[PDB]
Swiss-Prot record, chain A:
It comes from Sus scrofa. Residues 1-23 are annotated as: Disordered. Residues 1-27 are annotated as: N-terminal inhibitory region. The gene is ATP5IF1. One of its GO terms (cellular component) is mitochondrion. This is ATPase inhibitor, mitochondrial. The chain holds residues 26 to 100 of 108 of the full protein. It is found in: Mitochondrion. Residues 49-75 are annotated as: Antiparallel alpha-helical coiled coil region.
């Protein structure tokens, strides 16, 4: 009874709207993934938080070389 | 049929608006309604109209009536009562017209009660 506007139809994202045993098979499945990516990315925050100083560091060295050029021009 | 003796046809468009208008008359008088909201005299009112279409000894009346099924509910009180009188069905569907076939008749969902050897 779906090929008619009078016959009722369903929405998008209604499986988790019921609250059955597929809505809790999916609410828990998402926590068993996005809890273990939360410590792949909590461990690599030691490195890249030092790398953003290393990039800044890189820039600093570059700018000091330019200064050096100007200082030699003056000389 | 009576005064000439021929094989009459008769088209009613449609058999739901006959039924729906009986429920409006019956509720303007004051009668308490039946199941889902129709009138109490729903099967007799259809009876006294549908029984005058028979095959007497002089001639006959045949009938051909279009039916509207509300809310896709084939057990609704108005198409339930109308199906008790039918001797056939004809279904026109949207898909058989796409094939190019005329008239658009669905030969698997159209029935006849006298289909019997």
């Amino acid at each position: 009874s779906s090929d008619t506007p009078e016959g009722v139809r369903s929405g998008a994202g209604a499986v988790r709207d019921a609250g059955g045993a597929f809505g809790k098979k999916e609410q828990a499945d998402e926590e068993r993934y996005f809890r273990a990516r939360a410590r792949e990315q909590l461990a690599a925050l030691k490195k890249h938080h030092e790398n953003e100083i290393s990039h800044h560091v890189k820039e600093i060295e570059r700018l000091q070389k330019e200064i050096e050029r100007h200082k030699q021009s003056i000389k | 049929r009576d005064q000439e003796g021929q094989d009459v046809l008769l088209f009613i468009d449609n058999i739901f608006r006959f039924t729906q208008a009986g429920s409006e008359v019956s509720a303007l008088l004051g009668r308490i309604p039946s199941a889902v909201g129709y009138q109490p005299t729903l099967a007799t009112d259809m009876g006294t109209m549908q029984e005058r279409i028979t095959t007497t000894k002089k001639g006959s009346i045949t009938s051909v009536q279009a039916i509207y099924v509300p809310a896709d509910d084939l057990t609704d009180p108005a198409p339930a009562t109308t199906f008790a009188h039918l001797d056939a069905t004809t279904v026109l569907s949207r898909a058989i017209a796409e094939l190019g076939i005329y008239p658009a008749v669905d030969p698997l969902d159209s029935t006849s009660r006298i289909m019997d050897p």
